[PDB]
């Protein structure tokens, strides 16, 4: 019913460069919520009640908005931040999510070793997700033959 | 102390079948007013699509687009919440999370998320042809899938090694 619109759909930034992303809605929205999700894992509550940071969210993040103008602002982008951010509302049924902004690093393909290590780890959950979907492809592929055998 | 959620899925289904999901949780009860748990699903490489919800007072909410298919259930003593989806097709292949929302009347948001479960809708052709084959002929094709599967998996491994290599070379350099 209320449709959340996220722009930009994809955002490419440089480490240390302030950015801002927006979510706009058909109708007036009492509160805007934000969720971060790195590929392969569950989403994390990032910003709630339009401008409140969840436990463990870096101070470099910020939320702002009123009416149907809602925006997230990263003060100083860092490599760990690269993820898809979704906006969500519950002003009325049904609750709805935005398209999400995928945050990417300009230079993704010589920082501090901590940063390089962080990006190095982010890779593992994607690969597991991909591998698993290959297992269910063959779990699906396998099932017809089993049933035919299981007949008698 | 804190809240966890765990979703129990079936892995794979064929079309038209009733997909059923379990979500077990700890750290809160659905005997506490304001407590509620909703189902959200995410297609691979696509966005979040909220599904259903349920409250302490047994009050349900549904995606209007799919409500006829959906049904949401709860087990207050057992701390379980069930989502049943009927007559499934390819559009149901997704990763199904399970989340909590506290209803105060003001902000209603999802404060804790389970790990999620991944379901695949077997794109299902007529497979009556097999029933012509005997056991041993069927065993052959069954045996063929395992080497074929592990080759697509090592391909995903090699693909991510080539992604690791620029960062790895960045580490050893300095």
Author numbering:
A (entry chain B): 1 to 30, 32 to 110, 117 to 159
B (entry chain A): 0 to 31, 31A, 31B, 32 to 82, 82A, 82B, 82C, 83 to 100, ...
How did the manuscript describe this experimental structure?
HUTS-4 is a conformation-reporting antibody against β1 that preferentially binds to ligand-occupied β1 integrins. In order to maximize the stability of the complex as well as its conformational homogeneity, we utilized two antibodies in the Fv-clasp format; the affinity-enhancing TS2/16 and the conformation-stabilizing HUTS-4. The latter was included because it is known to bind inside the β1 hybrid domain in the open conformation and expected to prevent closure by acting like a wedge. Consistent with previous epitope mapping result, HUTS-4 recognized species-specific residues E371 and K417 located at the inner face of the lower region of the β1 hybrid domain, explaining why it cannot bind to closed β1 integrin with tucked hybrid domain. Unexpectedly, HUTS-4 also lightly touches the PSI domain, which may have contributed to the resolution of this domain in the cryo-EM map by fixing the PSI-hybrid inter-domain angle. As the first step toward the reliable atomic model building, we fitted the crystal structures of each unit contained in the complex individually to the map. Models of the N-terminal half of the coiled-coil domain of tLM511 and a long helix located at the bottom of HUTS-4 Fv-clasp were omitted from the model due to the low quality of the corresponding cryo-EM map.
Integrins are one of the most important classes of receptors that mediate adhesion of cells to extracellular matrix (ECM) components, which is the hallmark of multicellular organisms. Integrins exist as a heterodimeric molecule comprising two type I transmembrane subunits α and β, yielding various α/β combinations with distinct ligand specificity. Laminins are heterotrimeric molecules consisting of α, β, and γ chains and are major component of basement membranes. Recognition of laminin by integrin receptors is central to the epithelial cell adhesion to basement membrane, but the structural background of this molecular interaction remained elusive.
